[PDB]
Structure 1
Amino acid sequence: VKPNYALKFTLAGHTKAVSSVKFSPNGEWLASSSADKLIKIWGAYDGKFEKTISGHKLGISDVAWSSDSNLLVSASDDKTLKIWDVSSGKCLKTLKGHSNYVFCCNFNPQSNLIVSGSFDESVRIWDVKTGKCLKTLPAHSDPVSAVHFNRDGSLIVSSSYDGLCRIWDTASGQCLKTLIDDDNPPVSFVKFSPNGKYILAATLDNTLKLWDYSKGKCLKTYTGHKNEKYCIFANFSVTGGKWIVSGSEDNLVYIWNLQTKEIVQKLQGHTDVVISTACHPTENIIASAALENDKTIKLWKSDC
């Protein structure tokens, strides 16, 4: 069995590269961040432009939703993150502290905390209610490419060009584990599986890997695509069949069978690097976004 994703909508509006797309937890919206300094909100089902959210002084590399779908947090070249009230489009807090581009961000499931990763080589943990930085982790020795909380918020996983994936205790700030597979290619993305037991990691040698966190062992590798230069988002698709979904530098969305590691679909349409993919939380819907020669977001839908 293989999925049958087909192009449904193309969302045009950003005037520079799109950097990241994410579906709201309640399934109603898609948020996109862009090098054009804007966040845009679109209807998840109809692809309809809802609104533009502005305030950052420079382009934005990542955006993420709170668990109740009411807030967004954005990560910008202007060295700040901003927490936004989605309904009003207003900036509630500006999180200041990083000393170089902020590259990645995420809320914990409780959504009382935000974690951020930066080109300043640190990971920061922020109090959402007060806007205060709780911890500054000296996490890596090169830019931090991804940060993500596990299912109960007790752990944070980070990745870096230094070739490491590290797992941190949210409460104590202690580094609990370092994962590396003998060779040290730059790690460009990392994310916990929905059950918290695995970590999916991308490295800049055209390779994705599924790690068992507890055993600290690589279990599966996914290959065939192109990833040498960019920090591309990958996903666990779980609404239908169990797939791995990723962008690629040859302008395609790749879908692998999680268990067999076989490529099952390659989605054509984008005209530049697909930097970001996202999966709808309840329906078989994928969002993809591409870099500056393309500037569009695409919504793809499937029966399984």
Structure 2
Amino acid sequence: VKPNYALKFTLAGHTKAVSSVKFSPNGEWLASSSADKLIKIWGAYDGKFEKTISGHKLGISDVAWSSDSNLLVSASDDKTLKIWDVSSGKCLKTLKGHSNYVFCCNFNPQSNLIVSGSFDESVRIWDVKTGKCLKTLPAHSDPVSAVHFNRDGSLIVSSSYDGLCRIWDTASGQCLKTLIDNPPVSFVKFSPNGKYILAATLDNTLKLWDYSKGKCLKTYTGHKNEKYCIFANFSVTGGKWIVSGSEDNLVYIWNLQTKEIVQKLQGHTDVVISTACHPTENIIASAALENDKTIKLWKSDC
């Protein structure tokens, strides 16, 4: 079985490169962030523009949803994160403490915490309610490319240009494990079940790691990734795929177990910096850099 993603919508409105797209947990919405300093909200199923959320003074690298789909957090070159009320568009909190661009962010499952990664080489854990930094982890020796909580929020995985992936105990901030050749690690995230870590390196390679055993299980290649921190995903709604953007302007889809490329989605006219997989339907969102500036929604039968 191969999927058969086809283009459903192209979403225009950002005036600079799109940095990140993410589906709301409830499936209703896509949020997009951009170098244009804006967040935009779009209907997941009809592609309809809903609203613009503004307030950052510089570009945004990443955005993430709370579990109840009511809040967003954004990470900005203004050295802050902001927590947003999606319905009102209002900034509830500005999270201050990083000493350089904030690059990546995520809520925990409970959504009482946010984790952030920065060019300042640190990972910070923030209290959503107070907006105060709870912990600063001296996580890496170069910019942090990704941060992600596991299924229950007990662990954080981080990645860096330093060539390391590290796993952190949330409660204590202590490092439990380093996975260490050491090309820049450009992306990491836990599998939905929390057992595996998907890691991108800037040698055109994605790898699936068993967290428990610290061993590489699968390698995915054929795409182009030597420059940018490109988001990758587990697609679990139909077939079990790996989905990534690519610097050849394509969305790549692999069979997770066999590692074969099963589909390449053509249409973007710049680097596909971000992909996201819908929580319940076989829908991918993709987004591209400044020669394109659009988001595409794609749908598959499997």
Shift of 1:282: 0.3
| Misfit runs of 4+, over 6 Å | none
- CA deviations 1:229-248 (Å, max 9, x no partner) are 00000000000000000000
Distance 2:7 2:36 in 1: 25
- CA deviations 1:20-66 (Å, max 9, x no partner) are 00000000000000000000000000000000000000000000000
Shift of 1:292: 0.3
Shift of 1:10: 0.1
Shift of 1:265: 0.2
Distance 2:215 2:129 in 1: 37
Task: Look up the match of 2:45.
Answer: 45
Task: Look up the match of 1:152.
Answer: 152
Distance 1:173 1:87 in 2: 33
Shift of 1:172: 0.6
- Report SS of the residue matched to 2:218: strand
Q: Please give the TM-score of this superposition, normalised by the length of structure 2.
A: 1.00
Distance 2:172 2:116 in 1: 17
Q: Any stretches of 5+ residues in structure 2 without a counterpart? A: none
- Report SS of the residue matched to 2:257: coil
Shift of 1:154: 0.2
Distance 2:271 2:172 in 1: 39
- CA deviations 1:104-161 (Å, max 9, x no partner) are 0000000000000000000000000111100000000000000000001000000000
- CA deviations 1:280-300 (Å, max 9, x no partner) are 000000000000000000000
- Report SS of the residue matched to 1:248: coil
Shift of 1:189: 0.1
Distance 1:27 1:65 in 2: 11
Aligned sequence identity (%): 100
- CA deviations 1:156-186 (Å, max 9, x no partner) are 0000000000000000110000002xx0100
- Report SS of the residue matched to 1:196: coil
- Report SS of the residue matched to 1:62: strand
Shift of 1:266: 0.2
Task: Look up the match of 2:217.
Answer: 219
Distance 2:263 2:26 in 1: 27
- Report SS of the residue matched to 1:31: strand
- CA deviations 1:215-266 (Å, max 9, x no partner) are 0000000000000000000000000000000000000000000000000000
Distance 2:209 2:163 in 1: 15
Shift of 1:205: 0.2
Distance 2:293 2:154 in 1: 36
Distance 2:293 2:170 in 1: 36
Distance 1:57 1:21 in 2: 20
Shift of 1:208: 0.1
Task: Look up the match of 2:260.
Answer: 262
Distance 2:290 2:100 in 1: 22
Task: Look up the match of 2:98.
Answer: 98
Shift of 1:12: 0.2
Shift of 1:272: 0.2
Distance 1:73 1:302 in 2: 29
Q: How many residues align?
A: 302
Shift of 1:194: 0.1
Distance 2:66 2:300 in 1: 26
Q: Please give the TM-score of this superposition, normalised by the length of structure 1.
A: 0.99
Q: Any stretches of 5+ residues in structure 1 without a counterpart? A: none
Shift of 1:93: 0.1
- Report SS of the residue matched to 1:26: coil
Distance 2:173 2:223 in 1: 35
Shift of 1:102: 0.2
Distance 2:173 2:16 in 1: 37
Task: Look up the match of 2:294.
Answer: 296
